[PDB]
Amino acid sequence: KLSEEQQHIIAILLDAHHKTYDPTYADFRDFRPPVRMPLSMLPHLADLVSYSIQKVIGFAKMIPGFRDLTSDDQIVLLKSSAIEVIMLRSNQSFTMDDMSWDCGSQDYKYDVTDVSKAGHTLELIEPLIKFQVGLKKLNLHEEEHVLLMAICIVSPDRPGVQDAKLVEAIQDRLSNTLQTYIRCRHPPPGSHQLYAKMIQKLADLRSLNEEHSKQYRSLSFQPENSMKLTPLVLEVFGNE
Amino acid sequence: KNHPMLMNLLK
Numbered sequence: 001k002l003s004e005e006q007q008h009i010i011a012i013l014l015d016a017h018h019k020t021y022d023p024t025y026a027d028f029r030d031f032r033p034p035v036r037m038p039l040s041m042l043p044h045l046a047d048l049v050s051y052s053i054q055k056v057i058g059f060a061k062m063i064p065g066f067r068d069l070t071s072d073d074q075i076v077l078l079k080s081s082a083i084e085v086i087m088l089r090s091n092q093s094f095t096m097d098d099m100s101w102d103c104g105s106q107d108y109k110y111d112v113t114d115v116s117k118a119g120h121t122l123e124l125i126e127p128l129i130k131f132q133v134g135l136k137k138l139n140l141h142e143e144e145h146v147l148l149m150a151i152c153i154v155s156p157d158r159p160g161v162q163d164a165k166l167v168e169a170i171q172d173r174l175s176n177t178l179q180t181y182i183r184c185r186h187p188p189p190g191s192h193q194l195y196a197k198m199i200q201k202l203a204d205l206r207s208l209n210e211e212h213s214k215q216y217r218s219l220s221f222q223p224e225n226s227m228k229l230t231p232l233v234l235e236v237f238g239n240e
Numbered sequence: 241k242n243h244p245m246l247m248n249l250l251k
């Protein structure tokens with residue numbers, strides 16, 4: 001069964017996610033408006049990414065053990081994982097009905113063309129959509145989804161990590177919780193090789209991160225596009 | 241590298 005510590009860990013991460021992910025998307029009204037006519041969707045989508053980084057941070061601070069890391073390592077982990085957790089957490093709004101992210105209204109429904117109108121190409125978008133479909137298809141429990149985000153953040157192999165032993169230790173506690181959760185609470189047939197498939201998604205996220213990094217470097221290098229970004233996005237993803 | 245915003249949000 002799940003130990004009391006494992007049950008504790010899950011409860012904390014569920015609550016953390018609930019406190020940082022508003023399924024009504026009410027705060028979207030505060031963003032620069034979407035424009036679908038250049039890079040017309042960049043102001044709206046940069047604000048959405050900026051907002052999302054803040055939420056990912058609020059979630060990360062609540063991960064059991066994350067507080068025991070130094071601020072240096074906290075920074076390295078958040079900076080390397082931010083885009084990956086945003087792509088992960090975005091699965092909640094993603095829908096296979098029409099391959100889009102549906103955040104409540106037609107204004108806040110983003111399709112492949114919207115993403116391309118933020119300065120990114122199919123080199124990123126096609127694998128991103130394929131990621132989202134394969135992730136959807138796993139039909140994760142919310143418990144598994146929040147554990148996966150947390151494991152994504154506390155990855156010891158991120159470049160610049162100083163205390164990799166401690167990061168690996170925190171991650172192992174989460175990974176063991178997820179494996180045990182799948183065994184005890186996820187019924188077959190759904191549970192078939194589920195953990196291995198979740199870890200494969202973390203691998204897919206690394207390739208998405210690399211490609212995002214490449215396209216962002218190129219996008220932000222043009223000072224007219226970097227003007228469209230936010231101070232937080234620049235700090236987290238880079239300022240040329 | 242200096243990450244005052246990230247640092248601030250991390251508390």
Ligand SMILES: C=C1[C@H](O)CC(=C/C=C2\CCC[C@]3(C)/C(=C(\C)CCCC(C)(C)O)CC[C@@H]23)C[C@H]1O
Nearest residue numbers: 045046049052086087089090093101110115118216
């Ligand atoms: C709150 C939510 C998530 O945090 C974010 C979300 C969707 C995330 C998306 C869909 C549109 C494109 C977007 C924002 C995306 C990009 C346009 C690429 C990053 C753009 C930039 C930072 C400018 O490189 C990465 C994640 C993608 C909706 C909702 O689930």
